Amino acid sequence: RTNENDPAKHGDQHEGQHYNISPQDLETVFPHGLPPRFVMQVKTFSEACLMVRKPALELLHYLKNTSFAYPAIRYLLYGEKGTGKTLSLCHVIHFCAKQDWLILHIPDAHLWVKNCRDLLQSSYNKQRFDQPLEASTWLKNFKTTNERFLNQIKVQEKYVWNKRESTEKGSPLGEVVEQGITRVRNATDAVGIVLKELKRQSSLGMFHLLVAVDGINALWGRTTLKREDKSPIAPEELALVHNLRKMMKNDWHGGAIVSALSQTGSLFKPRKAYLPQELLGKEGFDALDPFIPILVSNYNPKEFESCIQYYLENNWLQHEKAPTEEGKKELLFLSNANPSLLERHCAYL
Amino acid sequence: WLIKEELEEMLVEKLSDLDYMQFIRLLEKLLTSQCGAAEEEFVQRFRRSVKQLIEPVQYDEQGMAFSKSEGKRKTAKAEAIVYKHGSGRIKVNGIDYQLYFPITQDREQLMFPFHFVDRLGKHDVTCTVSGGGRSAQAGAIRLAMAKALCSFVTEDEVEWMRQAGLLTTDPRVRERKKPGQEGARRKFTWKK
Numbered sequence: 001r002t003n004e005n006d007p008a009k010h011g012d013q014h015e016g017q018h019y020n021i022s023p024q025d026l027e028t029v030f031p032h033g034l035p036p037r038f039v040m041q042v043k044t045f046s047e048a049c050l051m052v053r054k055p056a057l058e059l060l061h062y063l064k065n066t067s068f069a070y071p072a073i074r075y076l077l078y079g080e081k082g083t084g085k086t087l088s089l090c091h092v093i094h095f096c097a098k099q100d101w102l103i104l105h106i107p108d109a110h111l112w113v114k115n116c117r118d119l120l121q122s123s124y125n126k127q128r129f130d131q132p133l134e135a136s137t138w139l140k141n142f143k144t145t146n147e148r149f150l151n152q153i154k155v156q157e158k159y160v161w162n163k164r165e166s167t168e169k170g171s172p173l174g175e176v177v178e179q180g181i182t183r184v185r186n187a188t189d190a191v192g193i194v195l196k197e198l199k200r201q202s203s204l205g206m207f208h209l210l211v212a213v214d215g216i217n218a219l220w221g222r223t224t225l226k227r228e229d230k231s232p233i234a235p236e237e238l239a240l241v242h243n244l245r246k247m248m249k250n251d252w253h254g255g256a257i258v259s260a261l262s263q264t265g266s267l268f269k270p271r272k273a274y275l276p277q278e279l280l281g282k283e284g285f286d287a288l289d290p291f292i293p294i295l296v297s298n299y300n301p302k303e304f305e306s307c308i309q310y311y312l313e314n315n316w317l318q319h320e321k322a323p324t325e326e327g328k329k330e331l332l333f334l335s336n337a338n339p340s341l342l343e344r345h346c347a348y349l
Numbered sequence: 350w351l352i353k354e355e356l357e358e359m360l361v362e363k364l365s366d367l368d369y370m371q372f373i374r375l376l377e378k379l380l381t382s383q384c385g386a387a388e389e390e391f392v393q394r395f396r397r398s399v400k401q402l403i404e405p406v407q408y409d410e411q412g413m414a415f416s417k418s419e420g421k422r423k424t425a426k427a428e429a430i431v432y433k434h435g436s437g438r439i440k441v442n443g444i445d446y447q448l449y450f451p452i453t454q455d456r457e458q459l460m461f462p463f464h465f466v467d468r469l470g471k472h473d474v475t476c477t478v479s480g481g482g483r484s485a486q487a488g489a490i491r492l493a494m495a496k497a498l499c500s501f502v503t504e505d506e507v508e509w510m511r512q513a514g515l516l517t518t519d520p521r522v523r524e525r526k527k528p529g530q531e532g533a534r535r536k537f538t539w540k541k
């Protein structure tokens with residue numbers, strides 16, 4: 001627990017100590033992407049406190065020392081399951097949002113490559129498929145996150161929606177987002193246009209872009225979507241995945257491509273796969289290369305003690321033996337300091 | 350007291366259960382009746398005489414002391430090496446235990462020996478388990494770890510572990526199916 005709540009001042013001095021997120025910042029920056037279990041914890045405790053950890057600190061250091069003139073750099077958070085990749089990414093997202101970046105946050109790229117009831121065919125390119133439900137959901141979340149810059153950003157082309165309806169150069173990107181959200185059939189096209197506009201305008205200095213993608217390994221992997229002919233669909237055929245792939249290139253500048261691997265929710269990957277190549281594959285590693293991999297490891301003893309103390313202060317560990325040294329040692333052994341396992345065990349302990 | 354068969358062998362005669370009991374009662378009366386050497390020399394002609402094996406502590410190349418043990422549960426066989434000093438790390442088949450045994454029950458079984466002797470976080474373990482399922486492997490590793498740790502705990506602690514059942518090889522194994530019935534004990538539905 002730190003009195004410091006600004007995501008720009010905390011450093012190694014605050015390592016292993018907590019960092020608060022105000023309710024307004026949680027409702028604005030994080031309408032999506034927070035872990036479901038962390039969301040449940042936030043609702044229960046009424047507080048959103050993230051432990052500051054070396055991965056987040058290092059990625060913040062890189063982002064603060066970044067040179068926007070240089071091409072946008074790719075950072076890839078990798079680590080064993082439940083080590084904290086998603087929450088470190090969320091910490092960096094909060095830092096950038098407080099620094100007034102435009103946050104293009106994909107909460108889980110895995111959702112876009114599986115379990116899709118509505119898989120239409122794109123009208124812009126008949127060889128690609130649309131995912132209207134996911135596109136509209138992400139557009140709503142993006143509008144909520146970046147409404148402030150949404151009216152200040154203008155488009156720089158003509159975008160035809162129907163054979164008659166169109167959006168004109170100089171119109172706010174809010175018009176594009178609203179069209180996508182309201183007309184669910186144009187959601188994927190709105191997402192593509194938004195990605196293109198943000199990528200092009202980040203180079204002009206209009207703002208600084210943070211492309212924060214969780215489960216990035218889903219783009220260049222396989223998919224569990226079948227055509228009407230019971231034919232498998234590779235990711236490139238999906239309009240959303242193709243546009244996000246284009247976004248993931250460092251050809252542009254004026255921002256950073258932060259991403260996090262996630263075996264959880266992946267397809268055709270073994271449970272114990274966590275390394276960058278193991279999770280990305282040849283295509284994914286080729287696309288991301290060069291990139292800076294950042295290791296997210298289990299809690300060190302100081303972090304474990306801090307998290308246990310946080311739960312005890314919240315009275316979450318209702319078991320009478322939890323505060324004891326023996327109980328702490330038992331928790332440490334059972335979870336092997338793994339954040340997710342420790343949280344899950346304390347959820348019922 | 351020698352058995353009726355032994356007494357018969359001595360007497361080159363066939364006895365009965367009640368005869369043997371009578372003789373044993375008489376001998377017990379003799380024993381109770383402050384039998385001295387003159388009597389004990391006779392009595393002893395009819396008397397018949399009736400802890401964990403700590404492993405040696407070995408040393409690795411780097412001079413660190415450890416103990417090696419093995420344990421089998423069902424079809425699972427585990428070889429466990431426990432080092433005298435460590436930070437509680439347990440590497441099973443080269444994988445961290447929380448990854449090899451994603452099941453809380455199996456992790457608890459791994460914990461049970463060390464937690465019992467109050468040595469959590471004091472020992473490093475390298476285990477290799479083959480055969481069986483997850484639970485059989487966890488039990489075999491638990492037995493091997495307990496046996497290895499016996500070399501590093503005191504004799505009283507070793508006896509306490511034995512009394513807690515941490516050093517007994519579970520003899521419960523799958524019972525063979527029998528012909529004419531559904532399973533080991535399940536019988537085919539009777540048709541009156």
Ligand SMILES: Nc1ncnc2c1ncn2[C@@H]1O[C@H](COP(=O)(O)OP(=O)(O)OP(=O)(O)O)[C@@H](O)[C@H]1O
Binds near residue numbers: 035339340344
């Ligand atoms: N830095 C952190 N601060 C606070 N809680 C954390 C932190 N990292 C992990 N946790 C806890 O762990 C859970 C979130 O784990 P998280 O999603 O970060 O892991 P992950 O490895 O990214 O997930 P996945 O299993 O999808 O890879 C929550 O219960 C949360 O409280």
Ligand SMILES: Nc1nc2c(ncn2[C@@H]2O[C@H](COP(=O)(O)OP(=O)(O)O)[C@@H](O)[C@H]2O)c(=O)[nH]1
Binds near residue numbers: 122159188189191196
């Ligand atoms: N409907 C519509 N979508 C557009 C338009 N311009 C860009 N897009 C979106 O972005 C994609 C096209 O991106 P573009 O930069 O032209 O590259 P391309 O996909 O290689 O042709 C489309 O599939 C849409 O999702 C436009 O004028 N109308």
Ligand SMILES: [Mg+2]
Binds near residue numbers: 087262
């Ligand atoms: Mg995650």
